[PDB]
C-alpha cells in the first residue's frame, strides 16, 4: 500500500510518500456550494491527471490558492483539484480520498 490509482480505471495518480500535511493534517473535510462533502487528501505531487481550464479563487477551501479541476487523465473521473498561486507551497493537489485505490508500487 504505497501508490494511489484512479479507482475507476487504474491510472497511476500519486504515492503515500507524497502526502502533504497542509495546516498540520493531510486530510481536510470540506463542502462545496451544492452541499457535497469531500474527504480531501493533500499531496505535494501527482501524475496522470488532466487539469481543466484556468484557475479560479471562487469558493477556494485553501486560503491564498486558486484551483483548477483535476480529472483522471485516462477515464475523466473527477479526482480533485490542483491548487496554485499561493505560498509555501505555491502549488499542491487536493484529491478525493474515496476516488482513489491504494496498493503496491
Ligand atoms: O477549493 C475548492 C475547489 C472547487 C470547489 N467547487 C465545487 O466542487 C463546485 C461544484 C459546483 C459549483 C461550484 C463548485 C466549487 O467552487 C469548491 O467549492 N472549493
Ligand atoms: Zn480513471
Coordinates of C-alpha atoms and ligand atoms in Angstrom, one line a residue:
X1 CA 0.0 0.0 0.0
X2 CA 2.3 2.7 -1.3
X3 CA 0.7 4.1 -4.6
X4 CA -2.7 5.6 -5.3
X5 CA -4.5 4.8 -8.6
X6 CA -7.8 6.0 -10.0
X7 CA -10.5 3.8 -8.5
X8 CA -12.5 3.8 -11.8
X9 CA -9.7 2.7 -14.2
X10 CA -6.3 2.1 -12.5
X11 CA -4.4 5.1 -13.9
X12 CA -1.4 5.8 -11.6
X13 CA -2.1 9.1 -9.7
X14 CA 0.1 9.6 -6.6
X15 CA 2.1 8.0 -3.8
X16 CA 1.7 7.8 0.0
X17 CA 5.2 9.3 0.2
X18 CA 3.9 12.5 -1.5
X19 CA 1.2 13.2 1.2
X20 CA 1.4 16.8 2.3
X21 CA 0.3 18.0 5.8
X22 CA -1.3 21.3 5.0
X23 CA -2.0 23.1 8.2
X24 CA -0.9 20.1 10.2
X25 CA -3.0 17.4 8.5
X26 CA -3.0 15.9 5.0
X27 CA -6.8 15.2 5.5
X28 CA -9.3 18.1 5.1
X29 CA -13.1 17.6 5.0
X30 CA -14.9 20.2 3.1
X31 CA -18.2 21.0 1.3
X32 CA -19.0 22.7 -2.0
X33 CA -21.8 25.2 -2.6
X34 CA -24.0 22.2 -3.7
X35 CA -23.6 20.7 -0.2
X36 CA -21.4 17.8 -1.4
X37 CA -18.9 16.6 1.3
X38 CA -15.4 15.7 0.2
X39 CA -12.7 14.0 2.2
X40 CA -9.7 15.7 0.6
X41 CA -6.1 14.3 0.9
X42 CA -3.4 16.9 0.1
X43 CA -0.4 15.7 -2.0
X44 CA 2.7 17.7 -2.9
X45 CA 2.7 15.8 -6.2
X46 CA 0.5 13.8 -8.6
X47 CA 0.6 12.5 -12.1
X48 CA -1.8 11.1 -14.7
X49 CA -4.3 13.9 -14.2
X50 CA -5.7 16.3 -16.7
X51 CA -6.0 19.9 -15.3
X52 CA -9.0 21.6 -16.8
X53 CA -9.3 25.3 -17.8
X54 CA -7.7 28.2 -16.0
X55 CA -7.5 28.8 -12.2
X56 CA -10.3 30.3 -10.1
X57 CA -10.3 31.6 -6.5
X58 CA -14.1 31.3 -6.1
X59 CA -15.1 29.3 -3.1
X60 CA -11.5 28.1 -2.5
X61 CA -11.1 25.8 0.5
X62 CA -7.4 26.8 1.0
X63 CA -6.6 30.4 1.7
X64 CA -4.5 32.1 -0.9
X65 CA -4.9 29.3 -3.5
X66 CA -6.7 29.3 -6.8
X67 CA -8.0 26.0 -8.1
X68 CA -8.4 24.0 -11.3
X69 CA -10.4 20.8 -11.7
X70 CA -8.3 17.7 -11.9
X71 CA -9.7 14.8 -13.8
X72 CA -8.2 11.4 -14.2
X73 CA -6.3 11.8 -17.5
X74 CA -7.3 8.3 -18.6
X75 CA -11.0 7.9 -17.7
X76 CA -12.1 11.5 -16.9
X77 CA -13.2 10.7 -13.4
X78 CA -13.2 13.8 -11.2
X79 CA -10.4 13.1 -8.8
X80 CA -9.9 16.5 -7.2
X81 CA -8.2 19.9 -7.8
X82 CA -4.8 21.4 -8.4
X83 CA -4.1 24.4 -6.3
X84 CA -1.7 27.2 -7.3
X85 CA -0.9 30.9 -6.9
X86 CA -0.4 30.5 -3.1
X87 CA 2.6 30.5 -0.8
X88 CA 4.7 27.7 0.9
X89 CA 3.9 25.7 -1.1
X90 CA 3.0 27.7 -4.2
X91 CA 1.1 24.7 -5.6
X92 CA -0.3 21.3 -4.4
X93 CA -3.0 18.7 -5.2
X94 CA -6.2 18.1 -3.2
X95 CA -7.5 14.6 -4.2
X96 CA -10.8 13.0 -3.1
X97 CA -9.7 10.0 -1.0
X98 CA -12.6 7.6 -1.9
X99 CA -12.0 8.1 -5.6
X100 CA -8.5 6.5 -5.3
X101 CA -7.4 2.9 -4.7
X102 CA -4.2 2.3 -2.7
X103 CA -1.9 -0.6 -3.4
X104 CA 1.6 -1.9 -4.1
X105 CA 4.1 0.0 -6.4
Ligands
LIG1 O1 -11.5 24.7 -3.3 C1 -12.5 24.4 -3.9 C2 -12.5 23.6 -5.2 C3 -13.7 24.0 -6.1 C4 -14.9 23.5 -5.3 N1 -16.2 23.7 -6.1 C5 -17.1 22.6 -6.4 O2 -16.8 21.2 -6.2 C6 -18.2 23.1 -7.2 C7 -19.3 22.5 -7.8 C8 -20.2 23.3 -8.4 C9 -20.1 24.7 -8.5 C10 -19.0 25.3 -7.9 C11 -18.0 24.5 -7.3 C12 -16.9 24.9 -6.5 O3 -16.3 26.2 -6.4 C13 -15.0 24.3 -4.0 O4 -16.1 24.6 -3.5 N2 -13.8 24.7 -3.4
LIG2 ZN1 -9.5 6.9 -14.1

